[PDB]
Amino acid sequence: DPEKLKILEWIEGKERNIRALLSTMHTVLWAGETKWKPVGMADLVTPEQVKKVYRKAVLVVHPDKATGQPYEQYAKMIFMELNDAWSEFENQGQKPLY
């Protein structure tokens, strides 16, 4: 399906980059999603900011909440990528943007 390709294209280039994924995730969310709000790089400076934004993203694409939904598969792909990116962020010392 189309949507799935849009997701792969999205992942391509940003793999394991948490800030890159969060700041553009609104470009891949499914239609109808209301909780999430576009986020820019200026809101992902401090580690605290990132974690806060990551936490809100994970709740929006959480699998257990998507089980039985048309976007279930999409939420899972996004979920994994976010968690892997966070894990990577930790392995980097969670360095501030500047």
Two tokens, residue 43 = 């809101």
| CATH code for the domain defined by 1-98 | 1.10.287.110
Query: How many other CB atoms sit within 10 Å of the CB of residue 17?
Result: 14
List helix spans (H) across 1-98.
2-11, 18-22, 47-60, 63-66, 72-90
Q: In angstroms, rounded to a whole number, what is the distance separating the alpha carbons of residues 10 and 60? A: 18
Q: Does residue 56 contact residue 39 with C-beta atoms inside 8 Å?
A: no
Residue with tokens 């580690």: 47
Instruction: Calculate Rg over the CA atoms of the chain.
Output: 13
Within 13 A of 51's CA, how many CA atoms are on the CB side?
Answer: 8
Resolution (A): 2.5
CA of 87: how far to CAs of 6, 38, 67, 81, in Å?
24, 22, 24, 10
CA atoms of 44 and 75, how far apart (whole Å):
22
Q: How far apart are CA 6 and CA 11, in angstroms?
A: 9
What is the full DSSP assignment across 16-44? T-HHHHHTTGGGTSPTT--S-----GGG-
Q: How many other CB atoms sit within 10 Å of the CB of residue 36?
A: 14
Residue 21 to residues 25, 47, 67, 68, Cα–Cα distance (Å): 6, 15, 22, 25
Contact call for residues 23 and 44 (beta carbons, < 8 A): yes
Residue type, 64: D
